[PDB]
Each structure stands twice: as structure tokens, then as C-alpha cells.
Coordinates of C-alpha atoms in Angstrom, one line a residue:
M522 CA 29.7 26.5 26.5
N523 CA 26.1 26.7 25.3
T524 CA 24.2 23.4 25.0
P525 CA 21.6 23.9 22.2
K526 CA 19.1 21.0 22.4
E527 CA 16.7 19.4 19.7
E528 CA 18.5 16.9 17.5
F529 CA 17.5 17.1 13.8
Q530 CA 15.0 14.3 13.2
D531 CA 13.6 15.0 9.7
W532 CA 16.1 13.0 7.6
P533 CA 15.0 11.2 4.4
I534 CA 15.6 7.8 6.1
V535 CA 13.2 8.8 8.9
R536 CA 10.6 9.8 6.3
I537 CA 11.0 6.5 4.5
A538 CA 10.6 4.6 7.8
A539 CA 7.1 6.2 8.4
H540 CA 6.0 4.0 5.4
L541 CA 7.2 0.7 7.0
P542 CA 6.7 -1.4 10.1
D543 CA 9.5 -2.1 12.7
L544 CA 9.4 -5.7 11.4
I545 CA 11.2 -4.3 8.2
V546 CA 13.0 -1.1 9.6
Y547 CA 14.8 -3.2 12.3
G548 CA 14.7 -6.5 10.3
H549 CA 18.4 -6.7 9.1
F550 CA 17.7 -9.8 6.9
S551 CA 19.3 -11.8 4.0
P552 CA 19.5 -10.5 0.4
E553 CA 18.0 -13.9 -0.9
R554 CA 14.6 -13.6 -2.5
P555 CA 12.3 -15.2 -1.3
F556 CA 13.4 -14.7 2.3
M557 CA 11.4 -16.5 5.0
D558 CA 11.4 -16.1 8.8
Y559 CA 9.3 -17.6 11.6
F560 CA 8.2 -16.2 15.0
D561 CA 5.2 -16.0 17.3
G562 CA 3.0 -13.0 18.1
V563 CA -0.5 -11.5 18.5
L564 CA -2.2 -10.0 15.5
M565 CA -4.9 -7.3 15.5
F566 CA -6.9 -6.6 12.4
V567 CA -9.0 -3.4 12.5
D568 CA -11.6 -3.2 9.7
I569 CA -11.8 0.5 8.7
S570 CA -14.2 -0.1 5.7
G571 CA -16.7 2.1 7.5
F572 CA -14.2 4.9 7.0
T573 CA -13.1 4.1 3.5
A574 CA -16.8 4.0 2.5
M575 CA -16.6 7.8 2.6
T576 CA -15.1 7.9 -1.0
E577 CA -18.8 8.1 -2.0
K578 CA -19.7 11.0 0.3
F579 CA -16.6 12.9 -1.1
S580 CA -17.4 12.2 -4.8
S581 CA -20.4 14.6 -4.4
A582 CA -20.3 17.9 -6.4
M583 CA -20.9 19.5 -2.9
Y584 CA -17.1 19.2 -2.2
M585 CA -16.4 21.5 -5.1
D586 CA -12.9 20.7 -6.4
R587 CA -11.6 19.4 -3.0
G588 CA -13.2 16.0 -2.4
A589 CA -9.8 14.2 -2.3
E590 CA -8.2 16.8 0.0
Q591 CA -11.2 16.7 2.4
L592 CA -11.2 12.8 2.3
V593 CA -7.6 12.4 3.2
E594 CA -7.9 15.0 6.0
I595 CA -10.9 13.3 7.7
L596 CA -9.5 9.8 7.1
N597 CA -6.1 10.8 8.6
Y598 CA -7.9 12.5 11.6
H599 CA -9.7 9.3 12.6
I600 CA -7.0 6.8 11.5
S601 CA -4.2 8.7 13.3
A602 CA -6.1 8.1 16.6
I603 CA -6.2 4.3 15.9
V604 CA -2.5 4.3 15.0
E605 CA -1.6 6.3 18.2
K606 CA -3.5 3.7 20.3
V607 CA -1.7 0.7 18.7
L608 CA 1.7 2.4 19.0
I609 CA 1.3 3.5 22.7
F610 CA 0.1 -0.1 23.6
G611 CA 3.4 -1.4 22.0
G612 CA 2.1 -2.7 18.7
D613 CA 3.8 -2.6 15.2
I614 CA 1.4 -1.4 12.4
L615 CA 2.3 -3.9 9.6
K616 CA 0.0 -2.7 6.7
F617 CA -2.9 -0.5 5.7
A618 CA -4.3 -3.0 3.2
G619 CA -7.8 -4.2 2.2
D620 CA -9.6 -1.4 4.0
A621 CA -8.0 -2.5 7.3
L622 CA -5.0 -2.0 9.6
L623 CA -3.0 -5.1 10.5
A624 CA -0.9 -4.8 13.6
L625 CA 1.5 -7.2 15.3
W626 CA 2.9 -7.7 18.9
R627 CA 5.9 -10.0 18.2
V628 CA 6.8 -11.8 21.4
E629 CA 8.4 -15.1 22.7
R630 CA 5.8 -17.9 23.2
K631 CA 5.9 -17.7 27.0
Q632 CA 4.7 -14.1 26.8
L633 CA 1.7 -14.6 24.5
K634 CA -0.7 -15.0 27.4
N635 CA 0.1 -11.6 28.9
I636 CA 0.4 -9.8 25.6
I637 CA -3.1 -11.0 24.6
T638 CA -4.3 -9.0 27.7
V639 CA -2.5 -5.8 26.5
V640 CA -4.0 -6.3 22.9
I641 CA -7.5 -6.8 24.2
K642 CA -7.2 -3.6 26.3
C643 CA -5.9 -1.8 23.2
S644 CA -8.9 -3.1 21.1
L645 CA -11.4 -1.9 23.7
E646 CA -9.8 1.5 23.8
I647 CA -9.9 1.7 20.0
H648 CA -13.6 1.1 20.1
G649 CA -13.8 3.8 22.9
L650 CA -12.5 6.4 20.3
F651 CA -15.7 6.0 18.2
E652 CA -18.3 5.6 21.1
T653 CA -20.2 8.9 20.3
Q654 CA -19.0 9.8 16.8
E655 CA -21.2 10.1 13.6
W656 CA -22.3 13.2 11.6
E657 CA -23.6 11.9 8.1
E658 CA -25.6 9.1 9.9
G659 CA -24.1 6.9 7.1
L660 CA -20.8 5.3 6.0
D661 CA -20.4 4.4 9.8
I662 CA -17.5 5.8 11.9
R663 CA -17.1 2.5 13.9
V664 CA -14.7 -0.5 13.5
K665 CA -14.6 -4.3 13.8
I666 CA -11.6 -6.0 15.4
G667 CA -10.3 -9.5 15.0
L668 CA -7.4 -10.8 17.3
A669 CA -5.3 -13.9 16.8
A670 CA -2.2 -15.4 18.3
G671 CA 0.3 -18.0 17.5
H672 CA 2.8 -19.0 14.8
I673 CA 3.6 -16.3 12.2
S674 CA 5.8 -16.5 9.1
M675 CA 7.2 -13.6 7.2
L676 CA 7.9 -13.6 3.5
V677 CA 10.0 -11.0 1.8
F678 CA 10.1 -11.1 -2.0
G679 CA 11.1 -8.8 -4.9
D680 CA 14.0 -8.0 -7.1
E681 CA 17.1 -5.8 -7.1
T682 CA 15.0 -2.6 -7.0
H683 CA 11.7 -3.4 -5.3
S684 CA 10.8 -5.4 -2.2
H685 CA 7.4 -6.5 -0.6
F686 CA 6.5 -8.4 2.4
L687 CA 3.7 -10.6 3.7
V688 CA 2.9 -12.2 7.0
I689 CA 1.6 -15.8 6.4
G690 CA 0.3 -18.7 8.6
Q691 CA -2.6 -20.0 10.7
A692 CA -2.7 -16.9 13.0
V693 CA -2.8 -14.6 9.9
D694 CA -5.6 -16.8 8.3
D695 CA -7.4 -16.7 11.8
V696 CA -7.1 -12.9 12.3
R697 CA -9.0 -12.0 9.1
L698 CA -11.6 -14.9 9.8
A699 CA -12.1 -13.5 13.3
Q700 CA -12.6 -9.9 12.0
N701 CA -15.2 -11.2 9.4
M702 CA -17.3 -12.7 12.3
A703 CA -17.3 -9.3 14.1
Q704 CA -20.2 -6.9 14.0
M705 CA -19.3 -3.2 14.5
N706 CA -17.9 -2.5 18.0
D707 CA -17.0 -6.2 18.5
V708 CA -13.7 -7.7 19.4
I709 CA -13.5 -11.4 18.2
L710 CA -10.7 -13.7 19.4
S711 CA -9.5 -16.6 17.1
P712 CA -9.9 -20.1 18.6
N713 CA -6.1 -20.3 19.3
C714 CA -6.1 -16.8 20.8
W715 CA -8.9 -17.9 23.2
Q716 CA -6.9 -21.1 23.9
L717 CA -3.8 -19.0 24.8
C718 CA -5.4 -16.0 26.6
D719 CA -5.7 -15.3 30.4
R720 CA -9.4 -16.3 30.9
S721 CA -9.4 -14.6 34.4
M722 CA -9.2 -11.2 32.6
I723 CA -12.3 -11.6 30.4
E724 CA -15.9 -12.5 30.0
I725 CA -16.7 -14.0 26.5
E726 CA -19.6 -15.4 24.5
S727 CA -19.6 -18.1 21.9
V728 CA -20.0 -17.2 18.1
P729 CA -22.6 -19.5 16.5
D730 CA -21.1 -22.3 14.2
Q731 CA -17.6 -21.1 15.1
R732 CA -14.9 -21.9 17.8
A733 CA -14.0 -18.1 17.9
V734 CA -15.2 -16.1 20.8
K735 CA -16.6 -12.5 21.3
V736 CA -15.1 -10.4 24.2
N737 CA -18.0 -9.0 26.2
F738 CA -15.9 -7.4 29.0
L739 CA -12.3 -7.0 30.2
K740 CA -12.9 -7.5 34.0
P741 CA -9.5 -8.1 35.6
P742 CA -8.9 -9.5 39.2
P743 CA -9.4 -7.1 42.2
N744 CA -5.7 -6.4 42.8
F745 CA -4.9 -5.8 39.0
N746 CA -3.2 -2.6 38.0
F747 CA -3.0 -2.2 34.2
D748 CA -0.2 0.4 34.3
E749 CA 2.0 -1.8 36.4
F750 CA 1.1 -4.9 34.3
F751 CA 1.9 -3.0 31.1
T752 CA 5.3 -1.9 32.5
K753 CA 6.1 -5.6 33.1
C754 CA 5.1 -6.4 29.5
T755 CA 7.4 -3.8 28.1
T756 CA 10.4 -5.9 29.2
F757 CA 9.5 -8.1 26.2
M758 CA 8.9 -5.2 23.7
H759 CA 12.3 -4.7 21.9
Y760 CA 11.5 -1.3 20.4
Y761 CA 9.2 0.4 22.9
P762 CA 10.2 4.0 23.1
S763 CA 11.9 4.6 26.5
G764 CA 14.1 6.7 28.7
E765 CA 15.2 9.9 26.8
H766 CA 12.9 8.8 23.9
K767 CA 9.7 8.0 26.0
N768 CA 8.0 11.0 24.4
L769 CA 8.2 9.5 20.8
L770 CA 5.6 7.2 19.3
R771 CA 8.2 5.2 17.4
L772 CA 11.9 4.4 17.9
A773 CA 12.1 4.8 14.1
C774 CA 11.8 8.6 14.6
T775 CA 15.4 8.4 16.0
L776 CA 16.9 6.7 12.9
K777 CA 20.0 8.4 11.7
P778 CA 21.4 8.5 8.1
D779 CA 22.8 5.1 7.1
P780 CA 23.1 4.7 3.3
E781 CA 23.2 0.9 3.4
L782 CA 19.9 0.8 5.5
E783 CA 18.3 3.5 3.4
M784 CA 19.1 1.6 0.2
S785 CA 17.3 -1.5 1.7
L786 CA 14.3 0.4 3.0
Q787 CA 13.6 2.6 -0.1
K788 CA 12.9 -0.6 -2.1
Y789 CA 9.6 -1.0 -0.2
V790 CA 8.3 2.5 -1.2
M791 CA 6.9 3.8 -4.5
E792 CA 9.2 6.1 -6.5
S793 CA 6.6 9.0 -6.5
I794 CA 6.6 8.7 -2.6
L795 CA 10.4 8.9 -2.6
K796 CA 10.2 12.0 -4.8
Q797 CA 8.0 13.7 -2.2
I798 CA 10.2 12.6 0.6
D799 CA 13.2 14.1 -1.3
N800 CA 11.3 17.4 -1.5
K801 CA 11.3 17.1 -5.3
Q802 CA 7.5 17.1 -5.5
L803 CA 4.8 19.1 -3.6
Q804 CA 3.6 17.4 -0.3
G805 CA 0.0 17.4 -1.5
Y806 CA 0.5 16.1 -5.1
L807 CA -0.5 12.5 -4.4
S808 CA -3.8 13.2 -2.7
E809 CA -6.2 13.0 -5.7
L810 CA -9.4 11.6 -7.2
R811 CA -8.0 10.1 -10.4
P812 CA -9.2 7.7 -13.2
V813 CA -7.3 4.5 -13.1
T814 CA -7.7 0.8 -14.1
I815 CA -7.4 -1.6 -11.1
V816 CA -6.0 -5.1 -12.0
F817 CA -6.5 -7.2 -8.9
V818 CA -4.6 -10.6 -9.0
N819 CA -5.4 -13.4 -6.7
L820 CA -3.2 -16.5 -6.4
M821 CA -4.6 -19.5 -4.6
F822 CA -2.5 -22.3 -3.0
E823 CA -3.3 -25.5 -1.2
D824 CA -1.0 -24.5 1.8
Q825 CA -1.6 -20.7 2.2
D826 CA -0.4 -21.0 5.8
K827 CA 3.1 -22.4 4.9
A828 CA 5.7 -20.0 3.7
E829 CA 8.2 -22.7 2.5
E830 CA 5.5 -24.0 0.1
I831 CA 4.2 -20.7 -1.2
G832 CA 7.2 -18.3 -1.0
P833 CA 9.0 -19.5 -4.3
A834 CA 5.6 -19.4 -6.2
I835 CA 4.9 -15.8 -5.0
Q836 CA 8.5 -14.8 -5.9
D837 CA 8.1 -16.3 -9.4
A838 CA 4.7 -14.6 -9.9
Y839 CA 6.1 -11.3 -8.7
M840 CA 9.0 -11.4 -11.2
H841 CA 6.6 -11.9 -14.0
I842 CA 4.0 -9.4 -12.8
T843 CA 6.6 -6.7 -12.3
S844 CA 7.9 -7.3 -15.9
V845 CA 4.4 -7.1 -17.4
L846 CA 3.6 -3.9 -15.4
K847 CA 7.0 -2.2 -16.4
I848 CA 5.9 -2.2 -20.0
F849 CA 2.7 -0.2 -19.5
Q850 CA 3.7 1.8 -16.4
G851 CA 1.5 -0.2 -14.0
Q852 CA 2.3 -0.3 -10.3
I853 CA 1.9 -2.9 -7.6
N854 CA 0.1 -0.7 -4.9
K855 CA -0.3 -3.5 -2.2
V856 CA 0.2 -7.2 -1.6
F857 CA -1.7 -8.9 1.1
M858 CA -3.1 -12.3 2.2
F859 CA -6.8 -13.5 1.7
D860 CA -8.2 -16.8 3.1
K861 CA -6.6 -19.1 0.4
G862 CA -3.6 -17.1 -0.9
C863 CA -2.0 -13.9 -2.1
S864 CA -3.6 -10.7 -3.6
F865 CA -1.7 -8.1 -5.8
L866 CA -3.5 -4.7 -6.1
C867 CA -2.1 -3.4 -9.4
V868 CA -2.9 0.1 -10.7
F869 CA -2.7 1.6 -14.2
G870 CA -3.1 5.2 -15.2
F871 CA -6.3 5.5 -17.3
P872 CA -5.2 8.6 -19.4
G873 CA -1.6 7.2 -19.8
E874 CA -2.4 6.6 -23.5
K875 CA -6.0 7.3 -24.6
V876 CA -9.5 5.6 -24.8
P877 CA -9.3 2.1 -26.5
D878 CA -5.4 1.7 -26.3
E879 CA -5.0 1.9 -22.4
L880 CA -8.0 -0.3 -21.5
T881 CA -6.8 -2.8 -24.2
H882 CA -3.3 -2.8 -22.5
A883 CA -4.7 -3.4 -19.0
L884 CA -6.7 -6.4 -20.4
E885 CA -3.7 -7.7 -22.3
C886 CA -1.5 -7.3 -19.1
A887 CA -4.2 -9.2 -17.1
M888 CA -4.2 -12.1 -19.6
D889 CA -0.4 -12.2 -19.7
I890 CA -0.2 -12.4 -15.9
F891 CA -3.0 -15.0 -15.9
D892 CA -1.3 -17.3 -18.4
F893 CA 2.1 -17.1 -16.7
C894 CA 0.9 -17.5 -13.1
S895 CA -1.3 -20.5 -14.2
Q896 CA 1.9 -22.4 -15.1
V897 CA 3.8 -21.6 -11.8
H898 CA 4.4 -24.7 -9.7
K899 CA 2.1 -24.8 -6.7
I900 CA -0.2 -22.0 -7.9
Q901 CA -3.6 -23.9 -7.9
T902 CA -6.0 -21.0 -9.2
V903 CA -5.4 -17.6 -10.7
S904 CA -8.2 -15.1 -10.6
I905 CA -8.1 -11.5 -12.0
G906 CA -10.6 -8.7 -11.7
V907 CA -10.2 -5.6 -13.9
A908 CA -12.2 -2.4 -13.1
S909 CA -11.9 1.2 -14.3
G910 CA -13.1 4.5 -12.8
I911 CA -12.4 7.2 -10.3
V912 CA -10.5 6.2 -7.2
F913 CA -9.2 8.2 -4.3
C914 CA -5.4 8.0 -3.9
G915 CA -3.3 9.4 -1.1
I916 CA -1.0 8.9 1.9
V917 CA -3.2 7.8 4.7
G918 CA -2.4 7.3 8.4
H919 CA -0.4 9.1 11.1
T920 CA 2.6 11.4 10.7
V921 CA 4.8 8.7 12.1
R922 CA 3.1 5.7 10.3
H923 CA 1.3 6.0 7.0
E924 CA 1.1 4.4 3.6
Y925 CA 0.0 5.3 0.1
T926 CA -3.5 3.8 -0.5
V927 CA -6.0 3.6 -3.3
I928 CA -9.7 3.3 -2.3
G929 CA -13.0 3.5 -3.9
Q930 CA -16.0 1.5 -5.4
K931 CA -13.9 0.3 -8.3
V932 CA -11.2 -1.1 -6.1
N933 CA -13.8 -3.0 -4.1
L934 CA -15.5 -4.1 -7.4
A935 CA -12.2 -5.6 -8.8
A936 CA -11.5 -7.3 -5.4
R937 CA -15.0 -8.9 -5.3
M938 CA -14.9 -10.0 -9.0
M939 CA -11.6 -12.0 -8.4
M940 CA -13.4 -13.8 -5.5
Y941 CA -16.9 -14.4 -7.0
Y942 CA -15.5 -15.3 -10.5
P943 CA -12.5 -17.5 -9.5
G944 CA -10.2 -19.0 -12.2
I945 CA -10.8 -16.4 -15.0
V946 CA -10.0 -12.8 -16.0
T947 CA -13.1 -10.6 -15.4
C948 CA -13.7 -7.0 -16.3
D949 CA -16.4 -4.3 -15.6
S950 CA -18.6 -2.5 -18.2
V951 CA -16.3 0.6 -18.4
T952 CA -13.3 -1.6 -19.3
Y953 CA -15.3 -3.7 -21.8
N954 CA -17.0 -0.8 -23.6
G955 CA -13.9 1.4 -23.5
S956 CA -11.4 -1.1 -24.9
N957 CA -13.3 -1.1 -28.3
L958 CA -11.8 -4.7 -28.7
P959 CA -14.2 -7.0 -30.7
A960 CA -17.1 -8.2 -28.6
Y961 CA -16.2 -12.0 -29.2
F962 CA -13.0 -11.4 -27.1
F963 CA -15.3 -11.5 -24.1
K964 CA -18.1 -13.5 -22.5
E965 CA -21.0 -11.7 -20.8
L966 CA -21.2 -13.3 -17.3
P967 CA -24.1 -14.4 -15.0
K968 CA -25.0 -11.7 -12.5
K969 CA -23.9 -12.4 -8.9
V970 CA -24.9 -10.7 -5.7
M971 CA -21.5 -9.7 -4.4
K972 CA -21.3 -8.7 -0.6
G973 CA -20.3 -5.1 -0.2
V974 CA -20.9 -3.8 -3.8
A975 CA -24.3 -2.9 -5.3
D976 CA -25.4 -2.2 -9.0
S977 CA -22.1 -3.6 -10.5
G978 CA -23.4 -3.3 -14.1
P979 CA -22.8 -6.1 -16.7
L980 CA -19.6 -8.0 -15.9
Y981 CA -17.5 -9.8 -18.6
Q982 CA -14.9 -12.5 -18.8
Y983 CA -11.9 -11.6 -21.0
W984 CA -11.8 -14.8 -23.0
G985 CA -8.9 -13.5 -25.2
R986 CA -8.1 -13.3 -28.9
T987 CA -9.0 -16.9 -29.9
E988 CA -11.6 -19.6 -29.0
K989 CA -8.8 -21.1 -26.7
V990 CA -9.6 -21.4 -22.9

């Protein structure tokens, strides 16, 4: 008999899995919400804000009607190279969130030392991708890398239709803190990472007023062979593609139809993405420059590093947020950790209902979320930034590992407002002026110099309908 080769590998479940990390795809966990689990690993946080800064280059009339298409193509070109590096070095890309890629090497505690070596080598090779590259002489096609290691907690929350996850804990706090200390082309190790690492491999320098360290060089011992060392480390990498599948970047490319698994995984993915996956919408439909209103919600906790403490609070907040968003067709685009808690990137369509009505609705939704989340046990501070304007939307990343993302000046503005104006609902001038709501529903705020955003215009607090608050 003939032996035709080439198994079909383009199933809906495989396409869904491109949007998720191995942590979820192979997770097999409890139906209970919140769900918490605990493990150890090494985290890499790659700041790609230099790449996402290109939303401004591609807003130019020079791109004719194709700024969104050109942006996603160039972003995917460079980001795919980073993703391939992480995956070939055995990492799991957790999230494209906050203008960054967060990756994880989950391993037993005894193996953290050797895996830190693999992750440092990966980080240096990521920098190596961008060694020559630049054409606009601006926006900066370079990256900053923070690494951390230690205890990691995972939180899964959601309802019967939708699921989200977060990784939480001191290593998570440390990885974003380490990346913030980095200059372009730097690799910064968290204090615990530097405590746990193989010091014979590397030369470091101190970071002033910090216990974190900068990697100057990876200079291994004379008899060291990285390929042989990496092969040894793969013993501890559960899902590293191997044998017949050593040509694949992800084991998830081998997933076969399994209705129970697909039912679980689709909950993490937006319905408009599933429509495209099902070939019920054109593959290019979601790459666009569109007017939206961003509602960015920040929840602060005393113990942002402890999942048992914050998990029920996030679940409770999520159940309310999703009910408020449902009424006015808002979406949660992303959930991710900041230094003191949990950020929800919510998005409304701006011409989904016209002029004063939609902007009024986004403000009213913001206040509703603010009032409910303020009364959630263990939520210490709620802060909400509301900003309206043109953003880039699209599926960004590699063929095998990509996520729908929203980027642009107005996303960055809503994110900074919720940090610089904590404890209140704030909005930009487009939202304030557009809502046509009476002026006494607001308070004009003192101007702040917010790192990363320039010429913000007047900002306002949404005080609400009465003198209350």
C-alpha cells in the first residue's frame, strides 16, 4: 500500500491554542472559579514599547489607507523573531500585555539554577536580533529584558462562558521591576534571580539603589558546551518538541480535535477571534485603526503577591465588570498585573451608538465599576482611566503564538491616568467634550508630567451626577 504522509494540523482547536500558553493548553485544571495553583519558574519580561511606539509612524497620511495593515506586518515580522527565540530555548509565552511579552520556564526548584543560564542565553540572543536594525532613526527597534526566578502563583477566574488567567507573586512583581530598571539592550536579573543563578556563568554589575543586577557578559567555564548543557535541561521541559515532532515550534501544533478541551480553551479567546478561526470572517478583518473608548481599571491590594488573598476579590470584580460591559458591548481585551495589583484593559466601540450617548455610557460604566469594586472585600484602591481616540487593533505575534492586541497613544494615556490619578475615575478631553454631559459632573484636574505620554490635554475627574464623593 501507499503511505501518504503529512497529517492534517490546521484544526480549529490548533488555531485556538495559538492564542494561549502551554500553561493553559496543557493545564487540565478544576472548574472552580477562582482557581489557584502554585509552582516555581523563571520569568522573562521583554519590553517591546519601542515597537508599539510605531502606532504614531503608521498614523501618517503617508501610509494611505493601509497604516493598520503595514503596522501589523512589521510588528509581526520583528515580534515573530522574539517568539521563535523564546520557544526554541524552551520557554512558554504567557501573554502579550502592557507593550511587553511575558514568558515562563516552569521547572522544579532544583533545576532553577541551570534554567536561569538557558534564559540568560536566550535574552542575549533576543538582543542579538536587533543589533544592527533601525530605519526611521526613531521609535527604537531595541528591547529591554527583566528576568526573575522563584515562587509563581497562577489564578484562573471567569464565569461559565469566559476565562482569564494571571500569574501572581514575588517573582512576577520582581520581573516587571527588573525590566523597568533596564535601559535598551540590557538584561536585568531580580535579586532572587541573582541569588539563585550560576555565578560562574556570568559577569554582572550593580544597579544603583537596587539589589537587582545587570548582566554584562555570559562567559561560561572553558569546558562548557551550551548545546550539550541545553540537551540536559530539556529533561526537565515537559512539552519541548521532540523526536518525530522536533521540527515544530510548539507541541500545541499537534493537538487533535477534543470537544471537551476545545470547549475549555475557547473561553479564553474573544468571539470575533473564534469567528475568524471558524473561517466565518475574513482573516484580515481585525487588523484596523478604529475609534474606541479605553476604560482601564486598576485594582490595588495590600498583598498583590498572594493569590489566596486576592483571587476571590478579582473573581468578584470580574463578575461585576463583565455584567456592566455586557450591557454596552464592552470587552475585556487584557488582564495583567502591575506593581500593587490587577489591571483590566476594557474597550468600547466609539460609533456603537453616536456622539454624546456612547461616551456617556463609557463614563457611566466606569462609575458603576468604580462603585462596585470599591466595596469588594480586600480591594484597597480602585482607579479608572477613560480615554477615546484612534487605536490600532490586530492579531500580533507568531503564526504559532499570537494574541489580539490594542495599542496606541490613547491606550497608554488611559494606563498612565489610572496610575497618576489613583482612587478616582479620570477621563481625557475627547471623552469630556464628546459626552455633552453637564460640566459640573466633572472636575478639571491638576496637570501631571506622566512618563511616556506628552501633550495629554486637559484631564478630568468624573465626579458623577451629584455632589457625592
